[PDB]
Amino acid sequence: ARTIRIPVHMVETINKLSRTARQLQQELGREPTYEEIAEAMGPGWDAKRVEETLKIAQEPVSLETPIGDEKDSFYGDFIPDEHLP
Amino acid sequence: ARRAKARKRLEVVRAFLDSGNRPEWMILEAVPVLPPDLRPMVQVDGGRF
Amino acid sequence: MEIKRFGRIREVIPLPPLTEIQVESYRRALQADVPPEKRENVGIQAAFRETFPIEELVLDFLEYRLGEPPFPQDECREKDLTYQAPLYARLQLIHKDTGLIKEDEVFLGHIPLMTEDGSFIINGADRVIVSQIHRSPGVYFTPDPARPGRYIASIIPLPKRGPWIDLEVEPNGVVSMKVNKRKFPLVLLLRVLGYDQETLARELGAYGELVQGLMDESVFAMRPEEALIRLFTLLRPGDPPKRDKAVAYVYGLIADPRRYDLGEAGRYKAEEKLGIRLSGRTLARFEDGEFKDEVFLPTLRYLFALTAGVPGHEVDDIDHLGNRRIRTVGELMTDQFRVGLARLARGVRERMLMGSEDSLTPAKLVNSRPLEAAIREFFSRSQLSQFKDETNPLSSLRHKRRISALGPGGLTRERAGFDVRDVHRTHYGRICPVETPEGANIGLITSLAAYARVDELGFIRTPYRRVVGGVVTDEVVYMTATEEDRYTIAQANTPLEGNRIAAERVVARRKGEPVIVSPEEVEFMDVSPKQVFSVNTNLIPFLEHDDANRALMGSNMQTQAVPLIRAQAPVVMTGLEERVVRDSLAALYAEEDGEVAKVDGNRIVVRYEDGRLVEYPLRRFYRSNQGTALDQRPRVVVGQRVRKGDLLADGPASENGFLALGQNVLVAIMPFDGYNFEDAIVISEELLKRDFYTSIHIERYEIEARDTKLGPERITRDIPHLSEAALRDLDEEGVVRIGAEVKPGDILVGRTSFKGESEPTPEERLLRSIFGEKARDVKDTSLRVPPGEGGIVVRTVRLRRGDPGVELKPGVREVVRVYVAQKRKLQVGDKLANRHGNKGVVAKILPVEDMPHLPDGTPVDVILNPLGVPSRMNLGQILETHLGLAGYFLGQRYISPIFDGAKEPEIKELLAQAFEVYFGKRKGEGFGVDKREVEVLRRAEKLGLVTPGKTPEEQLKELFLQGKVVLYDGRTGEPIEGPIVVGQMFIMKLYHMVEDKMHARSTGPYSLITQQPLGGKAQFGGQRFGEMEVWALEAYGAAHTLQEMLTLKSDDIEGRNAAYEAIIKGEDVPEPSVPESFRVLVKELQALALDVQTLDEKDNPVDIFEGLASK
DNA sequence: TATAATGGGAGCTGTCACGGATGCA
DNA sequence: TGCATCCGTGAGTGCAG
16 A cells, blocks of 8 residues: 555554544544553553654655646655755 | 558558567567656655655 | 715615625534524534434434634644634434444544634634635526527536436437436436326427427336336446346435435525425435426426427526525535535444444444544635735735635636626626736636625625615615516616605616616615725725726735835725724724723723723734734723724724725826836835835744654754854854844754765865864754845744643654844835726835925925826826825815715815915915926916916916926926926835845756756746747747757756856856756656667767666 | 355536547438 | 547646745
């Protein structure tokens, strides 16, 4: 599924956040914080480690993602090439 | 009407004859891939891709 | 000063609440203020009632509630949150087999809330939801463009709530039907409804023309459920026609009031159209085993009687404003809501038949996310959710009253022809005919008329007084377009004694055509002229002397009025300048009678007669969406005694409660040595002196510091290789001190990121080896200031994580924002405009000793050029000056009502009275006529402006009343050979200032795949040299200049680098090689399996890749 | 790794005009 | 054979975005 493939067991635990965060929200009347997740997630789970878990759950975005409501611009054009000198 | 489409068709034969292309070549076995840099994967400011 | 009114038109009702179309609408969809028991099945409610209950186990809907927001309006603006309320919905699961009862109130997400003025806050930026215009639900007939005597009939529901259907009666006698563009004989369908051969002639029975052609018994030889399967084959080429699947497909298209909804509108329109009551908003019913038609035969009844000639069967005008209608904001979002709800229902039933059919609650059968997302969508990427226009307060109000034909549900730009855009007859007093944009959106985006309102069905209606006998009642009624057309309606200003129609010819419309008619024949009368135009258009004084195509520019151009730090209401007003400051909800008023307790640049506290001590705090120097300082200033003093509804602070661009879009200036209308050329404008340096046309502006400059796969970014005051002078304004941490001056190049926030795998290479590891400093491991990534920006740091916001209240997007440590300000004097390049469409750039600022001036020493402020007026045809600005002349010397402002204002005599009266002050002051103060005033008077006589043989005073009097005065050139003292028009004008500073648009690049960013320069001032762009520019150079034959453009200036990476080295080395630039973007063109044709090949004259290839792609 | 489970699901609508290739009295 | 009829292709510039 993902443009960046991730080990199946890492996917496995990602959805485990998605699901337990969702119930937290369904009990809270608001979305949980990083901390309120590491608690309901249990032991070996701190606020730091739910964060860096999300920041790899992060799906990339299209270079042709359309800019404006006409379409004569592409989100990739506003991106400077910093490799080439 | 027969004379007409044997022209249309024949045009395509000589198109191949004159050039040296093989008709079969309009069917790829090996699809090519375009260099990565021309279709990049980039980290934008937020470390996102 | 005195405020003299004109106008004979006693307007009966006032302007209605000018944001009601935004606020009334959303609230009639939320009902967050109604006890659920007392709610009514429209809006957020009706969507629940529609999707529920879910079916085989069953899950049914009890009621919803809404909680107050977790953060107040302003807190969300800062913290880039949304101003939204938590949505709870109580449910009860019940088992399709046993009698299970569980009941939780599951949380569905946050519904965003609309503020007091009509706006929204969405990740902390105000936004507007532009009501959308669309063809309305109902059934219509419109002649066939092919067969001049046969007429398509069409059947249209609300958008995406059912299919369109046409009933074109073919050239083979029997009547057709189109669904998903799949034509077939109508008959087959009537059968399925339980219809019998006889009961067709028993209902048609008149038009043996086709009534007898409609019937073809290759169909009649079947029972109802027999053709039921007949047609499932006609629309599903492949699906097994089981009598469980066909009743489901048809129903799921034509009788299922769950994906087929005519409007609530659609019901009434098709009802009165075909004159039949309609059980529900649905074409067919399923009742007592089979299908019972509701709409097909009535429609079939009309169409036939029309194609013969029956009376009362007219084609319909789909551009009438009875057949068009408005999807207000509330309706627009419940649409998106009714699509989130239906997605959640794909998510319950899925878990209703897999996972455990008895240990289940509502709580865990509902995934709130399909709902949460469709709402996040509507407000964050709709065509109809636009960044608010809070340039000045008029811009926000005009926005909320916009009407787009475009958007999801309406018209794609290409779908827009002529009829959509034309001003229709029935626009009269509903949609403004002026206020619309020039350009490609002309006639799609428009504005709500000022007296107009949208009824509960989504149609626009406008008010009218009822006349009986010939006397005019104070009883007003608002008509839809359709009923209007029933009456003869007298004109706003048809003249009256008391309240009887006093003329014998009255000027009236009958279905929008103008008719001259006696007061016996007159049924209704326009409320006012203000009722035919936009709000903005009603801000144009002397509108009836202004060709339409510039009224429009003076209309739009107002919403671009930068708010000026000394703003003033126009000397000549139209009467709305006060409501607008009111409903704009930007000024600040008195809730009840009382006395004023304290007063301060920061707050205004008032004791009331109720003893309550309210404390209105002042929104002071708030940055608007468009950068324009949204500043609230106080207008009372301690102990002031305030009756109700009086004022307590002026909003921005409001003076004592009047819409102050610009300044009033002394204007001379005369060519001035070339600086008038083509609408350019010359101004008196005396304007910047007294701080006229000055404005304050702000830009946010934001930066993040994020956790990296190479270290953390650090907000430090410790930037490598940087001199203390280059930090003398930064605090310990790396923030500029609040109150510094910052200019281009200056650090605003120091920052350090870690270097890469290019950590010092040899070339560099050696250069440091000589200097005693070794390679440093961090990097200057400081946020500097952009070219051509800057000002005075007014605030800073520093949000880390690890601090309370705060948590930012993953992997980001800390985010620092520094707001900068500038006081913008007027300068050479900025745009000025007046309410009549005179627009121009400040081309020159003379010092006061050069300005034309009057005999009594006074210099003018603006020299406009008369060449603007003739071909432009906007004469109002001419009158607006003349009555400005008078006002200037009497010390008066005026209120000239649109179309019912001050006329030429009334105003030449006022000029006489001014002349007395300007000259009689003189011939007493010890001075007579002046020698140059005669030489001019000599000329005026050759012209014919003055009667020869009259005392100079007599003649100067005569010139004055023509609004003309003697003017001495300040460069010579000699008089202008002629008498000039000089007066007082209202002139705004527009938003388009040179400061925001000067830009230039030598070399900068390039694009990933093309290596051509980026585009746009903010990226530090390059200028796009397009196909059309290339042509230009081509036609000149500048091969080398063009080639340059196409290689060394764009993407010939080799010769580009080679050039800039050549300049800094003082050498001529080098002949170029192949542009890089052409290489991409080669490689991209290989990826399509095409073998492109550069070749030399002897036909052998040529490697434009210098061997780097051969093996 | 083992009750049994055996053919989907959303269509989307108001432009236009020309040229070429295909079907049909 | 002549002529419906469908399918695919176009539909202005740059700048803000």
